Design a protein around this ligand. Structure first.
Ligand SMILES: *[C@@H]1O[C@H](CO)[C@@H](O)[C@H](O)[C@H]1NC(C)=O
Ligand SMILES: *[C@@H]1O[C@H](CO)[C@@H](O)[C@H](O)[C@H]1NC(C)=O
Ligand SMILES: *[C@@H]1O[C@H](CO)[C@@H](O)[C@H](O)[C@H]1NC(C)=O
Ligand SMILES: *[C@@H]1O[C@H](CO)[C@@H](O)[C@H](O)[C@H]1NC(C)=O
Ligand SMILES: *[C@@H]1O[C@H](CO)[C@@H](O)[C@H](O)[C@H]1NC(C)=O
Ligand SMILES: *[C@@H]1O[C@H](CO)[C@@H](O)[C@H](O)[C@H]1NC(C)=O
Ligand SMILES: *[C@@H]1O[C@H](CO)[C@@H](O)[C@H](O)[C@H]1NC(C)=O
Ligand SMILES: *[C@@H]1O[C@H](CO)[C@@H](O)[C@H](O)[C@H]1NC(C)=O
Ligand SMILES: *[C@@H]1O[C@H](CO)[C@@H](O)[C@H](O)[C@H]1NC(C)=O
Ligand SMILES: *[C@@H]1O[C@H](CO)[C@@H](O)[C@H](O)[C@H]1NC(C)=O
Lengths: 458, 458, 458, 458
């Protein structure tokens, strides 16, 4: 395939630049396909606000907390089944594909040829893609040591906190290897594998698993009211070039995710080429809708689940005497998204509408959890005060009305009040129905508790 | 001066890319200096939403309206003279400048050589800047012809509507020249210069001029509540390196515009180097506040004023049969802002806060009126329906709840209801206290009325 | 068509960046398709040597000479015929195209639907392409006034020198309009249209036309020895996906130019997608070969033709008292290429080989004459000396062993000796067999001689 | 310090784009500062020729050899101490620095905090630079696995060959770690540390060490003929702004390396801002000259020395049946340069001139050995033939007259003839005067010879 086809991520051409003095006068980031793929496609930085991510001058790093998703991965078992099916449905067309689907004629292989890769991080070992998730995680580890490394005492073991999802675990490991470089060994790094079982309660990197009363589908109804007409138009366009083509809107909907994962896996996907920006945007909003209403503030149970890690993170912030200053936590998009429902920095004031497409989406799921998502809390001293701020996918995201400190940070005293108010009236044990652990302890007790859950293939 | 210094517009270096597979995974556009300079600095495209600006497939162009600001300019008289005063205060420091202000020692000339350039477009003739306002307008005209020229009948004169401001008028001419290329002549283009005189009432590209009850400064005390502490900190930093340096917070505040203008004029400004991102962002928000409360929905009078052009534009869209399909109007940022107060697509639901810095700014002045600002309405037919949409600084901005047409456009029928809602209860004559023209007629009566005001230097 | 397809010019993907800290560590320019299209595709800057194109500090601009090709154009009459034929040959395939050629099924229109555009500059009026040649020329004019404008006395008419090729003429005009801005009129610009008739002799912007003894095909034999096997491999690949496909290597060869012009005309060409880099590179070298041996030092008659303009240019350089300091000449690639055979700055020491592909090509035709090619001679004073240097497609190209002056320039005294040696033993009248004008005079006599040749459609 | 200053590597601003339709029409890579810093500054990819670095379609990887320099490093002892001496001369200026040297006033620290870092790779651990040498090596390993890993059998140990230089050795380990990812261990990788001791003779990654008749300084008097006038001019400029500043031309010459090293160490260097492009280019050529005459074909001894690795590499390509297909060798720039003296693909036909500055430099040292230099031989099968080609710093560099295979590769049969031609009449023992090992055996006998030299700080 020509290097002129699918050789980048931008759904815009050179036309963007045609009347500019400088290419820097152009706004082309908006057209990045990843932003429309619901967090399934490769890592992308948050749009951000222009705030420098450097620690401000005259401030000194006190502590950092990373909450990271796994890196890019193969489809899940469930999705893989869907994509393999739609591939088989497509391939069983009797006819030669024309138009956007013409690539389907060209000895087009299914991008997951071995199902053992389903659920796995893409890596140099199983993928030819530059967007390999383990690569993402290693490069992140490196970058992260570069920036926050002065907080690391090399006489200390680096603790790593990870759920037992194999891909989350492998992320944590590639991250730690990036961070530690040629000092990485079984002795300089201790990984605490925190089980996803419901019996971990709030003592978890996936506290939703112990929250029995949380129904992620509490709002599927409202989400289903959002138009799917773009799926029909697209299906109809495919049929116009391919008469008799037997696929549905359901098949078409699956092809956005198919695009995202083939991109992850192969580094380029012809499946990405079949949709217009406008279809991408509507697909994207249907994902924001789904995630907002399942995983964020649209679901009235995410505050309480999200607060477990908000609390623990705040405890870490408040304890300045801990020898360890670097908190490395790895988990899933959903956990990070629910954590964000409690953080409250990327959460809209009102529930998302379904009767129109809002611009922008008041809730951007990919701005919070792309593949390789990173939610970082920086703590630093400036004079006689400590300040806290969030760096979400490499953008500083100021806490609303707590952004007066250097780098639009929140005085730790004010951050205390902010968190208090976010978590007011939450009670995990009681709202969730789970009498296991009521709070996170694993950041503190991992030396005396063995977090060695075995890895699951999810 | 090293080509490594001020060789671009981005307030970020290469660290943005350091853990990515592709540079397209980076979000660096948030860091563009222009976005913090309040519309004073060169043109920049609206961040946008990824909507293809192309006319959608199966859609046929019917009409386009352009509402354009003048291009990049030299400082106005007031600002220029304020910049000259600050320059002179700096030059009379006795001492060698150190730190960020050191460039002041280096035969640093004031950037406006001749005060005759105040108020004027920068151009190849008066400026060595690639960011020249006339270049921007000319390239825009070319691009605009390339996009919309199928709508132009070459047997017909191109009408141009411009206010009689020199810079605005010159913009219109460079644009028309870009548009018409080697067909440009006093025969193929007829420019209607619409006076900024208050006696023009609503029949004006600057209807605020005839609005007597409009007080742009009505909300200054609110606006002035916003923090100036960053100015003090910046000043103290300058003083720390330059003991006894005698300038004010007011001076420092003017150095932002000085930066924006020296950038326009010279193509680079050492003065841009003296601020942190955090200062630019607060500066930027002070401008958003001032313009929101003066020129937008913060001021109760702007909806009535803005509605004059909104109505006129709607009359144009409603009228199928006009031989002329390309509307080209040139005016100031203020008029376009007030216009947008009535358009209502880039207007926040609520008044801007003053007691903290919101992220993002709920009202982005530079998203609407950068130098060389362009507000475009495209009208196109898809099937048996006509659709309208806005392209503001090269980004489609869908109308809230009127964006289900192709390319997120509004059915002209629905667009009628939207406009009616926007202009409801407005009355120029009565609200403004002006009994001259009550409505725009210049788009229709310009062949019988001689619109030929003499140019003013403002 | 997806904005992920053909949305740039680079025959490389994101893979180039995958192991870098900064995207600026990547070399991706080498992959620009334009460089392989033999000067037929849009303008591209010369690779260059990193030499700043600014006039050095402490130097002051004395004089500038532009020798410019026309901008991007539609195919010629001859080429158009070839491309239309290959399109018709392709379209008459009975079968559905598969593979690279699949786009041929998709209601693929021939990109020159009206033959009146053959030979013409692409423009906003006849083309949707951002690469419109008139746009290129206008933007150049603007840029050129920005840089060299201090040499322009606005009390003077700008003289423009152009051959009577309609597209060259139109280039000169769009250039002059860019340069003059809103001061462009019949009075501020005087265009001297220099006939391409053989009877102009050396008094010509196309002195090859008066050189009867010049045989551009003196070396076709050696050029034909260069491998064409890549054409077979490509043809075979097309046939493998399309059994029965009746096209030849001749057809395939025509498709590189078809790619180049559809790119010019439409801004993107699916025809560009059918070749590998390796085919592009070999096509490209066959063009370098052809042009080197026809138009440059491989042909023993180009020195003498090239010296006519080298001499005239040098005369202009030596006459510091001329009121006019800006020499604007427009002509064809071949004339500029032959001029370069005499200039000697981009000419290899040995003739090009044909029995292998050399890397790099010792003679890069597209580095000298892309569409919109610009060969500029800058003259500037530094202290008590004047210096001369070449800026070829926006890159400074130092004269070998005359690059000691500021900006790697040649002292005008040394430049005199350099030109003397380049033109030693040339005699246009005698070597060419033409007893018309023996030397260029039109730079000096255009006020008293009327250069108003009528425009030809070539 | 402003993010507008030193925020990139390019010695050009936005003016490069000002008359283009697409920024991809610009040639800005010529302006990269790295290309003028003589291999001292961060990694940069070879400018290259547009050849796709992908394995050609229908070709199957058979073998790869990597010859890698150490990554970016701190200054060597000598250079570091020279930089410290210049820093101290500058700091003892009594006076406030003005002009380009003003940053010297701003609590400007010397960039090597601890002399223990001299000779060492920059890494996340000792450096906050994105350009860290270890990061570069690690990312390279990842990329290399992604490209070549189909050739790796995971049942087999990965052998690594490195010299015992600390920085080289560390490079090899970061690379291997990138390559092996979470499979890296002392079991999956076996590193063979090949001593730099002269007693190693030709069985060495640094065979120049055992070559007694090799005088790297044989040609210093030739090299010293090249102009130093630019140093005087630079110095006089520094003096003009700083009266009585007491530094030499020698000092100024060292400030180029200081720039390169501070860039490596800090990620930005104010010292890079003190030179013009024209000075960097002359500096750059002084380094090309020195290295051409010391480490390449300018020195009569390098072909014999280089031929040791050329022969060994050829023995590897000739031997189909080795279970190991991935050769990873790590050594210094000097060894790779001398290697290239025998490879002969980036070697000029003639000795470099000294009496002027050629464009381009006929021998580009940084094109061969930037920090993190990579010379790769790929061997792949196309049909019943095997092909060999070179990828130097991410660019395919075809062998002259052996580039007609797919991807401009050389049939291994032809490659044998090429190598034989290159090594003809060479004899290490006799030409070098060293009777220790006469040939490389370490690639074959490393499982029976213990290659385990102790690390040196050089
Ligand atoms: C390093 O860690 C050990 C074991 O935790 C501790 O006892 C010792 O105090 C530490 N050494 C230094 C130099 O900090
Ligand atoms: C914790 O959760 C697990 C799984 O739901 C359950 O078996 C156990 O009873 C719980 N423990 C308590 C004390 O509720
Ligand atoms: C968070 O901590 C507060 C105490 O500050 C507590 O009342 C609340 O239950 C906690 N929320 C969760 C879900 O852990
Ligand atoms: C806009 O038009 C409406 C009727 O559509 C009219 O009643 C109203 O006064 C107009 N507003 C202005 C301010 O021109
Ligand atoms: C129109 O505007 C003028 C100038 O401001 C004002 O003085 C006059 O009263 C107005 N005329 C009418 C008819 O209201
Ligand atoms: C302008 O040009 C005219 C006519 O060529 C000439 O006579 C006059 O001297 C010039 N005026 C100035 C101010 O240079
Ligand atoms: C000049 O050239 C033309 C065309 O070739 C020819 O008719 C004429 O005779 C020539 N004049 C002389 C004096 O040779
Ligand atoms: C160039 O000028 C020289 C005189 O300097 C002359 O001998 C030669 O004929 C000229 N060459 C051409 C072709 O005009
Ligand atoms: C390279 O190998 C040849 C035989 O192929 C041998 O005669 C020659 O001496 C070798 N050169 C070196 C320097 O190892
Ligand atoms: C090998 O090299 C050593 C160390 O430089 C040298 O002294 C010795 O003579 C050599 N040995 C032989 C066998 O030539």
């Amino acid at each position: 395939v020509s290097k002129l086809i699918n050789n980048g991520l931008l759904l815009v051409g050179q036309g963007a630049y045609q009347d500019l003095a400088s290419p820097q006068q152009a706004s082309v980031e908006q057209y990045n396909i990843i932003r429309f793929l619901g967090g399934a496609a490769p890592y992308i930085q948050n749009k951000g606000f222009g705030i420098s991510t450097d620690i401000p001058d005259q401030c000194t790093l006190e502590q950092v907390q990373l909450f990271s998703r796994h890196g890019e991965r193969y489809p899940s078992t469930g999705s893989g089944k869907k994509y393999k099916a739609v591939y088989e449905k497509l391939m069983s067309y009797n006819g030669t594909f024309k138009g956007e689907l013409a690539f389907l004629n060209d000895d087009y292989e299914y991008f997951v040829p071995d199902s053992v890769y389903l659920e796995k991080e893409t890596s140099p070992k199983n993928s030819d893609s530059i967007y390999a998730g383990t690569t993402d995680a290693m490069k992140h580890g490196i970058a992260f040591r570069t920036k926050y490394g002065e907080l690391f005492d090399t006489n200390d073991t680096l603790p790593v906190f990870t759920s037992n999802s194999g891909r989350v675990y492998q992320t944590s490991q590639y991250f730690a290897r990036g961070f530690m470089g040629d000092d990485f060994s079984n002795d300089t790094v201790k990984t605490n594998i925190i089980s996803e079982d419901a019996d971990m309660g709030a003592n978890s990197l996936t506290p939703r698993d112990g929250c029995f009363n949380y129904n992620e589908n509490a709002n599927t109804a409202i989400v289903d009211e959002y138009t799917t007409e773009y799926l029909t138009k697209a299906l109809n366009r495919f049929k116009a070039s391919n008469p008799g083509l037997n696929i549905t809107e359901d098949d078409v909907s699956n092809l956005f995710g198919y695009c995202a994962y083939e991109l992850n896996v192969k580094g380029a996907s012809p499946m990405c080429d079949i949709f217009t920006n406008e279809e991408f945007i509507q697909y994207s909003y249907s994902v924001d809708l789904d995630d907002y209403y399942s995983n964020s503030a649209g679901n009235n149970m995410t505050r309480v689940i999200g607060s477990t890690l908000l609390n623990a993170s705040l405890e870490l912030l408040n304890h300045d005497k801990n020898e360890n200053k670097i908190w490395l936590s790895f988990t899933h998009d959903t956990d990070i998204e629910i954590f964000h429902s409690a953080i409250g920095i990327l959460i809209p004031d009102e529930d998302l509408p379904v009767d129109y497409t809002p611009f922008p989406s008041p809730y951007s799921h990919v701005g919070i959890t792309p593949q390789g998502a990173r939610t970082i809390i920086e703590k630093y001293a400036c004079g006689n005060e400590s300040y806290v701020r969030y760096v979400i996918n490499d953008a500083v995201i100021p806490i609303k009305k707590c952004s007066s400190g250097p780098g639009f940070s929140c005085n730790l005293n004010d951050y205390n009040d902010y968190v208090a108010e976010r978590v007011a009236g939450t009670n995990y044990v009681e709202q969730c129905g789970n009498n296991n652990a009521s709070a996170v302890t694993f950041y503190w007790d991992y030396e005396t508790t063995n977090y060695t859950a075995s890895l699951i293939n999810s």
